[PDB]
């Protein structure tokens, strides 16, 4: 959702957000506003955000409007999300191979929450990688 | 493909969701109040 | 260009994108067994990148067919004649090495007998003067 989630205007802002959540985890969604997949992801995350609230936080990035972070993914640039804790990038190994970012839509709200939970746990442990409970290997 | 490579710095059931979003946006546009 | 060996200019980068087209063009303008060497027009980027033929090879259709037939005949004759015909090993050159050639090619021995059958005067009269040729001939008149 647009009204539900908080959205970011610039790269500096994004960086600040990433840094300044000490306690919570930070899911950024890097995506082009008017895309299907991105929209779907946002919708999913709207639901999740409220739930996960006390452990995670969700943010949005118009990737065309804020082009600072094409370092993150070598200009692959589909409509992705990324996970952050203590300003460290957090690495969520699915089947996909892109251990960096989930570049794909998941539909099970609960499933999404679970993966977020997992990554939070990993971050707390200190781990950089975390194996998702789920597999994926379909949604490349 | 080649073009894409060189230009490496420069550039079903979702329907309901889309509708929901779009309508919301329209509503927002209609009321840009305090 | 060779001497230079990495530049990475913008124009150069741009030019590359038309490489498969160029390749295709090159393939199209291949010399045929009747011909000796295809003296062909070209387009080229100022670097020495993206060199492609810009001639489009067109033929007199029945003439072309005739030529092809002649070539076939020649091949048949060759087959009839030689016993241990040399199968050309592939890949032809040293893979590890970089065996190109320009200067040598330029100042090489005479273009040795391409494939074209002998043509008697009585039977096949009016073609043999202009038959096995580049464009092919019957090109000025």
A139 contact partners, CB below 8 Å, separation of at least 6: A96, A104, A105, A106
CA dihedral C2, C4, C6, C8 (to 10 degrees): -90
What is the C-alpha to C-alpha distance for residues C141 and C139, in angstroms, rounded to an integer? 6
Q: Which helix (H) or strand (E) holds C51?
A: none
Give A120: exposed, middle or buried? Use CB within 10 Å, 0-12, 13-18, 19+. Answer: buried
What is the C-alpha to C-alpha distance for residues C24 and B17, in angstroms, rounded to an integer? 47
What is the C-alpha to C-alpha distance for residues C141 and C136, in angstroms, rounded to an integer? 12
Stretch 78-117 of chain A: residues touching chain B, C-beta under 8 Å: none
- Radius of gyration over alpha carbons of chain B, in Å? 19
Tell me the CA distances in angstroms from B15 to A104, A110, A120, B21, C139, one per residue in order: 18, 22, 32, 10, 64
CA angle at B20 for the pair B18 and B23, rounded to the nearest 5°: 105
Contact by Cβ (8 Å): A48, A54: no
What is the C-alpha to C-alpha distance for residues A87 and A68, in angstroms, rounded to an integer? 16
DSSP tag of C30: -
What is the C-alpha to C-alpha distance for residues A13 and A65, in angstroms, rounded to an integer? 13
Please tell me the distance in Å from B1's CA to the nearest CA on chain C: 8
What is the C-alpha to C-alpha distance for residues A20 and A86, in angstroms, rounded to an integer? 8
Please tell me the distance in Å from C17's CA to the nearest CA on chain B: 5
Test A36 with B18 for CB contact under 8 angstroms: yes
Nearest to B17 among A3, A43, A64 (CB): A43
Test B2 with C13 for CB contact under 8 angstroms: no
Q: What tokens does A110 get?
A: 């609960």
Q: What tokens does A111 get?
A: 């499933």
DSSP tag of B33: -
| Widest distance between CA atoms in chain C | 63
Please tell me the distance in Å from C52's CA to the nearest CA on chain B: 17
Q: What 3-state class would DSSP assign to A131?
A: strand
Q: Which of A86, A32, A85, A34 is nearest to A60 (CA)?
A: A32
Give A68: exposed, middle or buried? Use CB within 10 Å, 0-12, 13-18, 19+. Answer: middle
**Omega before A39 within 30 of 0, i.e. cis:** no
Nearest to B24 among A2, A36, A75 (CB): A2
DSSP tag of C24: H
Test C14 with B2 for CB contact under 8 angstroms: no
End-to-end Cα, chain C, rounded Å: 42
CATH number, domain A1-140, options 3.40.640.10, 3.40.1180.10, 3.40.30.10, 3.90.1010.10:
3.40.30.10
Chain B residues touching residue A43 (CB < 8 angstroms): 17, 21
Q: Which residue of C has its CA nearest to B2?
A: C17
Tell me the CA distances in angstroms from C128 to C33, C73, C115, one per residue in order: 16, 15, 14
Give C56: exposed, middle or buried? Use CB within 10 Å, 0-12, 13-18, 19+. Answer: exposed
A29-58: string of b/e by CB count within 10 Å (b at 16+)? bbbbbeeebbbbbbbbbbebbeebeebbbb
The residue extents of the domains of chain A are 1-140
Chain B residues touching residue A64 (CB < 8 angstroms): 11
């Amino acid at each position: 959702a647009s009204v539900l989630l908080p959205q970011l205007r610039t790269g500096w802002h994004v960086d600040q957000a990433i840094v300044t959540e000490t306690k919570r985890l930070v899911v950024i969604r890097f995506g082009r506003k008017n895309d299907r997949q991105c929209m779907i992801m946002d919708e999913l995350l709207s639901s999740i955000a409220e739930r996960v609230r006390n452990f995670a936080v969700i943010y949005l990035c118009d990737i065309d409007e804020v082009s600072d972070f094409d370092e993150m993914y070598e200009l692959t640039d589909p409509m992705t999300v990324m996970f952050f804790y203590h300003n460290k990038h957090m690495m969520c190994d699915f089947g996909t191979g892109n251990n960096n970012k989930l570049n794909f839509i998941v539909d099970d709200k609960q499933e999404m929450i679970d993966i977020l939970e997992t990554i939070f746990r990993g971050a707390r442990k200190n781990k950089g990688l975390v194996v998702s409970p789920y597999d994926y290997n379909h949604k490349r | 493909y080649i073009g894409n490579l060189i230009t490496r710095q420069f550039e079903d059931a979702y329907y309901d969701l889309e509708l929901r979003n779009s309508v919301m946006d329209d509503i927002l546009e209609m009321m840009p109040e305090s | 260009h060779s001497d230079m060996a990495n530049t990475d200019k913008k124009a150069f980068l741009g030019a590359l994108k038309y490489l498969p087209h160029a390749i295709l063009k090159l393939l199209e303008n291949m010399p045929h067994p009747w011909e000796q060497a295809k003296e062909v027009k070209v387009l080229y980027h100022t670097s020495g990148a993206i060199t492609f033929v810009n001639e489009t090879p067109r033929v007199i259709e029945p003439v072309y067919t005739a030529q092809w037939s002649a070539t076939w005949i020649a091949m048949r004759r060759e087959k009839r004649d030689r016993t241990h015909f040399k199968r050309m090993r592939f890949p032809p050159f040293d893979d590890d090495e970089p065996p190109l050639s320009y200067e040598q090619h330029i100042e090489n021995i005479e273009p040795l007998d391409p494939i074209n059958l002998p043509l008697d005067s009585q039977d096949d009269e009016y073609v043999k003067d202009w038959l096995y040729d580049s464009r092919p001939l019957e090109e000025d008149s």
